[PDB]
Structures are given as C-alpha cells and as structure tokens.
Design a protein around this ligand. Structure first.
Ligand SMILES: O=C(COc1ccc(F)cc1)N1CCCC1
Length: 93
C-alpha cells in the first residue's frame, strides 16, 4: 500500500498552465526555507526550479509515466524526461 510522500519520491507534478512535469520530492536542507503546511518541496527536472505543491498535484512516476512521460515542446521538458529516467537522485545545483 502507498505511504505518504517522502523526499526522493519521483512524480509527475501538475502546475496551472503546464503539462504534468517530471519532478521529485526534495529534502529541505538545514537552514533553508521550509514549505507551507501540507506542502512538499517539488524539484522540477529539466528546469531545475522548485515549487511547493500538495498531493493533489503529485502523480507517482511509475504509475503515470505511460501517460505523461512523452516529449513536449515546453522549455526544459525533454531534458527533464532524461533526468528522471537516467539520474533522478543527482545533484542538479
Ligand atoms: O513553475 C514551475 C516551478 O516553479 C518555479 C518557477 C520559476 C521559479 F523561478 C521558481 C519556481 N515549473 C513549471 C513546470 C516546470 C517548473
């Protein structure tokens, strides 16, 4: 059975106006800004941007990739497909 989201989990994450985007649940570093309650820090592959999202916008990657893991014309997307499949736990700082 599913657990709650934890850092390291791979997802597609949905933001208004954008396709379901390859992403991971990030850790929060010591001393860094925390997310709002009930939100997770989401690191978007390809763009390398972070936003705070709740579970309603988080689709586990294994279950969802057949539907959402297709090339897109949006900036950063196809790089991000490569990252989530090939090195999803790397440092992209
Ligand atoms: O909206 C976001 C991430 O959120 C931020 C965007 C810009 C920024 F400077 C900081 C955060 N994304 C939509 C799908 C790819 C990444």
């Amino acid at each position: 059975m599913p657990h709650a989201f934890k850092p390291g989990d791979l997802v597609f994450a949905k933001m208004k106006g954008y396709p379901h985007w390859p992403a991971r649940i990030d850790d929060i570093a010591d001393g860094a800004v925390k997310p709002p309650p009930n939100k997770y820090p989401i690191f978007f592959f390809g763009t390398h941007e972070t936003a705070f999202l709740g579970p309603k916008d988080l689709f586990p990657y294994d279950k969802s990739k057949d539907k959402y893991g297709k090339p897109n014309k949006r900036k950063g997307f196809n790089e991000g497909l490569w990252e989530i499949q090939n090195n999803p736990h790397a440092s992209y700082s």
